[PDB]
From Swiss-Prot:
Organism phylogeny: Eukaryota, Metazoa, Chordata, Craniata, Vertebrata
Disulfide bonds: 4-54, 13-37, 29-50
Clinical note on disease: Bethlem myopathy 1C: A form of Bethlem myopathy, a slowly progressive muscular dystrophy characterized by joint contractures, most frequently affecting the elbows and ankles, and muscle weakness and wasting involving the proximal and extensor muscles more than the distal and flexor ones. The clinical onset more often occurs in childhood or adulthood, but it can be prenatal with decreased fetal movements or neonatal with hypotonia. The hallmark of Bethlem myopathy is long finger flexion contractures. BTHLM1C inheritance is autosomal dominant.
Annotated protein name in UniProt: Collagen alpha-3(VI) chain
Location of this fragment in the whole protein: 3109 to 3163 of 3177
The BPTI/Kunitz inhibitor domain, residue ranges: 4-54
Gene: COL6A3
Amino acid sequence: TDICKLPKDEGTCRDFILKWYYDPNTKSCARFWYGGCGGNENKFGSQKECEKVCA
């Protein structure tokens, strides 16, 4: 899904939560801090879910 190729988007706001995004260059998911606003769909709550959908 093109969703998995969207770039990492930390967004804005200050309700910081650790999320996971898929990195097509390493073909694996990595952690990132999301502020709570203005992100995109390449964002998952767990490494396992991110891997299932995008790996």
